[PDB]
Amino acid sequence: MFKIGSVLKQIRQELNYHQIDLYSGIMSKSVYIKVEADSRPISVEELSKFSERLGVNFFEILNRAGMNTKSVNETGKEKLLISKIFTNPDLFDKNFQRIEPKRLTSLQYFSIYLGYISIAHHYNIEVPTFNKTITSDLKHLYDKRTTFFGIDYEIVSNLLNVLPYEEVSSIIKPMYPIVDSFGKDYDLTIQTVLKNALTISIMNRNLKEAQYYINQFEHLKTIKNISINGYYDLEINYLKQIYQFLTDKNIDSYLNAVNIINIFKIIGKEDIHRSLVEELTKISAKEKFTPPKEVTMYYENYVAIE
């Protein structure tokens, strides 16, 4: 269902390369025409080689072919849909009844499930099934886990928004520290867990937990290849500054926090800035973490709902 072949021809021609320039030493001119004509499955080992012949990025080729995630993939559409229902809650009922039963089919579906619970909580929509299943669900999913993948950090990241920290706490610890990078999407989610956790920690005034997360994020900066999120670096640092203010009590730390929050406004991130401000207000008043009215999300960018 992915025209990797047409793309290969496209790139080859655009760069003015002859077929003999690609298959020479890889395969017969006969079968190559089949690959390029998208009539013969292409192996990763082969595509990789063609990718070097062409000179174009391997992952870029896949993207051009249609690997642009969210494209079908089934679960991809479900995730983009979550954003829609957040704007049109009238579409919750029908869709939830569909996802809910298949929440444990795969780690992907569970994350989608948690996304829905967030919509229900935000619109005060009732979801009795939840409170009567999460514990078991989590047990079922992580009780015997060893290594974690990006989707896991995604799950835990969205789980922190629908379940008290005391319950998610235990599931997080084993997932850190991080030792290696496995793609930008992986680096994105592992940073989100720390950002979300550090927020709830500082908000509920759990200063020992807060330091842990500030240190875990700082550790990621020592792992070349992790590629840190600029926006997160800013947001996490503002929390780091509020943390210091709550301890070493120095107006400078608080002013820095404000300064950082303001920079978000100066660069056009109006939506995320408004949310930040709403958060500082709560922190300055010692309010514990409670799902706000401003719901922030992250797909390909850091955005707000409305």
Binding site: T69, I82, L188, E235, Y298
Partner: peptide
């Protein structure tokens, strides 16, 4: 902030 991620 507590953000929802979806890859």
């Amino acid at each position: 902030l507590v953000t929802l991620v979806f890859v």
